[PDB]
Symmetry: D2
Subunit: 422 residues, 4 copies
C-alpha cells in the first residue's frame, strides 16, 4: 500500500505508524516522474537496520564533512547533525548565532550535503586504491536537526524534503514555537499544542512518502523544562495549564512542566514518529527509566533517543563508574540512538585554543607536538597526517591518468614532499 | 596621487611600489560613488602596523569562524586563510578537493566573510557585557590565498575585489598556471612567465586602488620545485629553460628549478607587491637566509613571508633546538609574516579522530575527559565551556530586552543549564 | 542623541518617531568598531528626499538585477523588491514557491545585493566611458519586502540588518503570523496581535540604529482581508474579535476584517514606522481616501504607501480614465510610495511565453521581430540590443588595458560582431 | 561493457564514440555505491530521442526557471542554458559580468538545478489537478554551457559532474583558453591545441561514465574567428599557424582563422562527442552547408548544433524569406539542435524597459495594457495571469489538506482575489 510508494522500505518499516493522509494523497502530490534519492534510501535503511541490530547506536554532532569522516574512520556508525552547531559555525547566513532558529531554513540540509559529499570522496579514494574499504561503509547514516520545522506544517514539509535530497537518514522535530525557539537547555521555551506538533510530524511523513523514501522521524518534546504554551486549544494539554496564573503579555499560557507532560506528549506523538526523545535538565538514568517505562506501557518496544548533552557538567552530576556505564544502561532501556549534540563544537574550539596558545608561547615546537601526536595515532587508524591522500589528491591523479591514457606530465603525488618525507 | 584615492593609506605605505596604471585610470574605472570597505581598511592598516612594529607576525590557517575566534582569543595577532583548507572542507561546491584550484573562485572570499562575521559577533558580545575586550582587537588581520588568480588578470582582479569586500587585509597570488595549479609541495607544478605573474599582481593592485583600500599584496613563487613553464616568451625565464629536453606533450617547456629562479622572479616581482614569498621543499634556515640576502641586495628592507608547512616532517628534518628557534630566526632575517598553512585541518581532523575513537570504546568517559580538559583550560583564557555565551546568547538576550523595554518572558540565560551547572 | 549614532540622517529624519530602546542600548549593542554601509546610507537618504519632494515616487517589482537596471534606465526613481517574486523565481532554495514565507530568510537580502551590484556595474560602465551618466543616479533606492520578519522580533532584527548590508533603502514588515504567512491577496491570513507587530517594527528600528543607518521602515497591515488572529491578548484587538464563533481547531481567534481594524492598527503602528500601508482587496480610491483621512486625523502629514497589485483585475474594477489618474490621485491623499508588486513576474512570464510561442510557430522570424523592436526602442533610450556593452564588456576591456599598459592582444570589443554589425 | 555501467543508455547510444579510458577505469573511479541521477538520465535519453526523430530541435536560452517553464508550456521541446546569460544576470557571484568565464564555476549547474526545480513544480501542480498534463512532458532536456571547462581536464570533469547532478541532458565545451575565454562573437579569442580540447572532451565523458549517465557532450570550436593559439605543439594545428608573424607579447601563436581549421578540429573532435558545433560570425547557410558536408565526408550522419546568435544583426544580414526558412534549411543539413543563445536576456531587458517607460509616462494605464495582453493570450495557452495558481499555491493548499485530513482553516485559494476577480 504505502510500501509500493516507498519501494526501498523494508518489511515491517511502518508497523504501528499512523498517517493523516492516504496512499492516493501521495500519488496525487508527488508529480508524474520517479526521481531517486539514493543516499536518503541507503541511509534510512541502514539506520533502521542499525537501531534494531545494535545494543545501541551512538553518535557525535559534526559541524563539517572532515569531522564526519574522522568519526566514521574511527568506527562510529552514525553521524549527528546539530542545529545548535549549524547556528554557531556552519550556516547559510555566514554568521555566528545562538540556538534560536535565527539562521535560514536551508542551513541544515546544506551541511548534510556537505557531510555526504566528503564521505563520498572518502569512498572514492579507497575504491580507487583497490584494497577494499577501511570501514563497513563510508555512508554512515546522518540524523539531523530540523528544529521546530521553521514554522508551520508546510515549513516542516519543505525542510523534510530538503534533508532527504541532501541524503539524511533521519530528522528530528521538536514541539517548540519556531518564532521563539531555544536550545533545549536554555530557559524561556514555549511549547506548541500537542496537536500542532502532530501536524508537523505528519507533514514530515508526507514529505517522506512523497519523496518515496523511508526516512526516519524523531519526535522531541521540550516539556520537561518549558513553562509556557502558545494555546490551550488541545484538551490533552489543558490539565497542565495553570489558569490561576493567567496569560503572559505575549498571550502565552503558563504550564506545569516536568516528566508528566513529557510522558503524555510522547505517548500522543508515538504513532506519528519512529523514535521519541525527551529533552532533560540532567543526565539522570532513573528519570530516563521512568520515561522509558511509561512510554512502553502504552507502546511496547517503541524506540527512544537520548541527548547526552555537553550542556551538562558530567563529573559534577555523576561519578566515574556511572559515566562509564551511562550509554550502555540507556541502551538496555530502549534508547537506541544516543548522541553528544555539541561534541564537534567543543572539540574544534578547545583543540584550536590549545594549539594557538602553545603556538604563541613556543611557535613551531607547539605544532611539532601535534604532528608527532598525529604520527603516533596512525597505529590506531589515523591517516590524515598524509593530508594530500586524505583529501583525494591520489584519486584525482588517477582521474587524470585515465583521461590522458597515462601520459599526463603534471601528476601531483610522484614528486610530492608527502611521498618523500612520510 | 594614489594616497588621495586611498584615504586610509598611511605615510610611506607605497614606498618603492610601482603600478602599471595611473591614478586617472583608477578614477575612470571605479564608478561615480564612494563605497566604504571598513574591515578591509582596518585590517590592511593593522597588518601594515603589525609587520613593521613586531619582530615577526605569526599565524595559523583557519578553516572556520570559530577556529579564527579562538586564535584571536589565545593572543595570536593575525589569521591565515588557506586555499588548501578551503578545498579540503570549506568551499562553495560543498565537496572535498585536493589543492588544485578545483573549487569555485568565490570560496576563499566567502570563508573570509565567515571569519570576520564570527569575529564581529565576538566583539559584539564583549562590548555588550561592558567590561572591555579580552583581546587587543577581535579584528585580527586576515591574510588570504587567491591561489593563481583563477585564470587571467581579470580573474585576479575579481578575486581581489571579492576578498576586499569580505574584509581581507592581505591576499597572495602565486606564479603557477591556474588550470594545472597544485599545492606548492606536490609534483607537477607549471609556472607562468615572470611577465604574466606581474600582470596578475598589477590586476590585484588595480583592484585595491579601485576599491580605495591599502590591501597588502603577497607575491609567491613556486620555482623552487616546479620543473615546467608554460612559455619561454620572457627573456628573464629563458636562462632557466632546458632547451635540450624539448617541450612536453602539452607544449610546456622544461626548466631547471631551485633557488636561482626564485631569486630572479622574486627580484622581478618585488616592485609590484608588498611582501614576497618563496615556497620551499624543506624548512631550511640557511636557504631562507640565502634567499633573504639575495632579495635584500636588490631591494633593501623588503618584507618577506614564509610558509612553515605541515607538508614537512618537522622532527625528521630538524632537532628540537632548531624547531624551537625557527620562527624567531626567520624573523630576524626579515620574514615578518610567517604561517602554518594547514594547522586548522590537522587540529580539526586529529582532534575528532581521537575523540571519536575514545567515544567508540568508552562512550561518555571519553567525552567527560574533553570537558574536564576544557574546564582546566579556563585558567589560561578558555571560554567555550560556557557555550551559550560563546556564540552570543547573552548578546541576543540583551537585544531582546532593548526591543521589549525589558519585559520579554522568553529570554534564554537566567533559567539555562549553563547558568546552573557552570 | 540618536542623530550622533546615525551620522548620515538628515535634519528631522526621526521627527515623531518613538523608540522602545535608548541611545545607550544602541551604543552597547553595536560593537566596538565603526563599519559603514554606504549604499544603505545613500539609498535611505535619497528615498527620504524623493518621498518629500515628488508628487509621488512609483516603482515596479524587480526579480533580477537586469530588470532593475532597465527600470532605472527608463527613468524610474525607485525599485521595489517583492517577496512574492522571490518565492516564485529568485530565492535561495532554488525552487518555485507560493507566497507563504517558505523560502530561506536570506533570499530577499540576496536579491537586494544582486540588484545593487547590477546598478553598480551600470554606473562603472558609464563612468568609464567618460560622457556622464544617462540617468540621475544608477543607485535608485530599493524598498524591500521582509514579509512577517520570518518569526519573532529577533528574526525581524536579523532580516533588517541583512537588508541594510545588501543596500536596501527601506524595508516593510506586515502584521501576519510568519508560520502561516500568505500573499496579502490570498485567503487564510492570520494576524498577530497589534503589540507583537509593534515589537517587530522596533526590532527593525534597533537594527537600523545599531547598523547606524537611517533605513526607512514601512509598516503594513493585512487586517482588510484577514479573518484570523493568533491571540486576543491585546485589548486593542478585542473590539474586532468574534467571540461568538469560537476558536479554530488550531486555536486561532476569528476576527471581523475590514477598514476599521486597518485604521486602528495603522494608528497604533504610526509612531514606530516611516510609512504606513494597508493592503486592499480592490483598487478603490474612496477606501484609500478614507484610510488616509483617518490616519491623518491621528497623525497629520504621515506618509503612506499603496500597492497597485496585479492581483487585481484592473479593467474589471475600473474604467480607463480612473486607471489613468489612479496614482496621481493617490499621491494627493499622501500615498508617496506606490508600487506594482508583481510587475517583474508578469512581464517576464508574458514576454517569454509570447516569444516561445512565435518561435515554435516560425522560428527565426519570431526572434527577428524582437530584435527590430529593440532597434526601434533605441530612439527612446534603450541600449540592450548592443548586449556586449550592456553587461560591461567595454568596461573590462578598459580594465585589461590599464593592467597591460594598453598592450593586450586579447581585447574583446574592437573585433566583435557587435562593433561590426550594430553600427547606426 | 560501457552499457552495463550506464544502465539507462539506449541501444547504440555510443555507436562510433571513442574513449581514452577503459570500462575498468570507470569501475575503479566511481566509488562503491550506486547513486542515481534520475533527471539527467531522463533528460539525456529524451534529448537523444528528440534529435533522431524531429526534423530539428530548437531552443531558446533561459536565464530563469520561470522563463524555462513558459518555453515548455509554449510547446518548445528543449531548453538552452547560456553561460553568457549566467554571466549577465544569474551567477553565484551576484554580479553582472561580460562573457569571459569570470563567474564562479558552479553558476551554470546552479541555474540548471533552478530550471529543473521549477519544471518539477509545474508538473506537481498539474499532477495534483488530475486532468493530465498540458505538455508532452515538463522535463524538457536542458543543454547547458560549460564554456572552456573552467581550466584543465579535471575542471571539465568536475563541471560535467555538477551539471549531471543538476539534471542537465547535454553539456557543451569549447576549444578556448579558459583564462582568456570570450563569447564566440567577441574578438581576442585564444584557442587551445586540438589535443588539449580532446582531453577536455574525454574528461567530460569519463565524468558521465563515472556518474553512470548517458549525458550528451557537444564539442564546440571557436576557430572561425580566433586568431590566437596557446601552443603549436599539436601537428594538427600547425598548418594554420602563421609562423612568419611570430608569437604575441604574451607568448601566443597566431593562426589563419576561418572554416578550414573549424573543419579539421571538428573532424578530430568527432569521436569524442555526440554533436559538433562551429561558432560563426554571420548566419550563413552556405558556410553551414560547407561545414556540414566536410564533417560528413569524414563522419556520415554526424549530428550538428547551430547557434542562432543574437550577436548577429538578422535583417541586416538576410532578407525576410531566408530568415523565415533558416532553421528548416539547417535541419536538413543535420543541424538537429539549434538555439537562440541570448533569447532570455533580450526578452527580459526589452520587455521591462518598455514596461517601465510606459509606467513613467502614464502609470497604471501602461500596466493595464500588459494585463489585457495577458488575458488575450489565454486563448493561445497562457496561464500566468492567474499567478497564484502558476507558482503552486493550489498545490500547497492540497498539501495542507492532506497533512490535516481536510481540516485546515488557513488555506489560501478559496477566498483569494484570484478566485474572485479572474473567473
Ligand atoms: Mg537543536
Ligand atoms: Mg594555497
Ligand atoms: Mg510579499
Ligand atoms: Mg557561452
Amino acid at each position: 500500500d504505502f510500501y509500493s510508494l516507498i519501494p526501498s522500505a523494508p518489511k515491517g518499516r511502518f508497523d504501528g505508524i499512523e498517517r493523516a493522509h492516504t496512499a492516493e494523497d501521495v500519488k496525487r502530490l508527488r508529480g508524474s516522474v520517479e526521481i531517486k534519492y539514493s543516499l536518503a534510501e541507503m541511509g534510512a535503511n541502514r539506520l533502521w537496520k542499525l537501531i534494531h541490530e545494535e545494543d545501541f547506536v551512538n553518535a557525535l554532532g559534526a559541524l563539517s564533512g572532515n569531522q564526519a569522516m574522522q568519526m566514521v574512520r574511527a568506527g562510529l556508525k552514525a553521524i549527528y547533525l546539530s542545529g545548535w552547531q549549524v547556528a554557531a559555525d556552519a550556516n547559510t547566513a555566514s554568521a555566528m548565532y545562538p540556538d534560536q532558529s535565527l539562521y535560514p531554513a536551508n542551513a541544515g540540509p546544506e551541511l548534510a550535503k556537505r557531510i555526504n559529499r566528503t564521505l563520498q570522496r572518502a569512498d572514492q579514494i579507497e575504491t580507487a586504491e583497490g584494497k577494499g574499504l577501511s570501514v563497513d561503509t563510508w555512508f554512515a547514516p546522518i540524523v539531523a536537526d530540523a528544529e521546530a520545522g521553521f514554522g508551520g506544517p508546510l515549513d516542516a514539509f519543505e525542510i523534510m524534503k530538503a534533508y532527504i535530497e541532501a541524503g539524511a537518514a533521519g530528522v528530528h522535530f521538536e514541539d517548540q514555537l519556531a518564532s521563539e525557539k531555544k536550545c533545549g537547555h536554555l530557559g524561556g521555551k514555549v511549547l506548541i499544542p500537542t496537536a500542532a506538533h502532530i501536524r508537523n510530524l505528519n507533514a514530515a511523513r508526507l514529505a517522506a512518502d512523497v519523496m518515496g523514501t523511508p526516512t526516519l522521524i524523531v519526535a522531541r518534546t521540550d516539556a520537561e523544562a518549558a513553562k509556557l504554551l502558545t494555546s490551550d486549544i488541545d484538551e490533552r494539554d489543558q490539565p497542565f495549564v495553570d489558569y490561576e496564573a493567567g496569560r503572559t503579555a505575549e498571550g502565552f499560557y503558563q504550564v506545569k512542566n516536568g516528566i508528566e507532560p513529557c510522558i503524555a506528549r510522547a505517548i500522543a506523538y508515538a504513532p506519528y514518529c519512529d523514535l521519541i526523545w525527551m529533552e532533560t535538565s540532567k543526565p539522570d538514568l532513573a528519570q530516563a527509566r521512568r520515561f522509558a517505562e511509561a512510554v512502553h506501557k502504552a507502546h511496547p518496544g517503541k524506540l527512544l533517543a537520548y541527548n547526552c548533552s555537553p550542556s551538562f557538567n558530567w563529573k559534577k552530576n555523576l561519578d566515574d563508574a556511572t559515566i562509564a556505564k551511562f550509554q550502555r544502561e540507556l541502551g538496555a532501556m530502549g534508547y537506541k540512538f544516543q548522541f553528544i549534540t555539541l561534541a564537534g563544537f567543543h572539540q574544534l574550539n578547545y583543540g584550536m585554543f590549545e594549539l594557538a596558545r602553545g603556538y604563541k608561547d613556543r611557535q613551531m615546537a607547539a605544532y611539532s607536538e601535534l604532528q608527532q601526536a598525529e604520527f603516533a595515532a596512525e597505529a590506531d587508524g589515523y591517516t590524515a597526517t598524509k593530508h594530500q591522500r586524505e583529501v583525494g589528491t591520489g584519486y584525482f591523479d588517477a582521474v587524470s591518468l585515465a583521461i590522458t591514457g597515462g601520459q599526463s606530465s603534471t601528476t601531483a603525488m610522484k614528486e610530492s614532499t608527502e611521498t618523500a618525507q612520510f
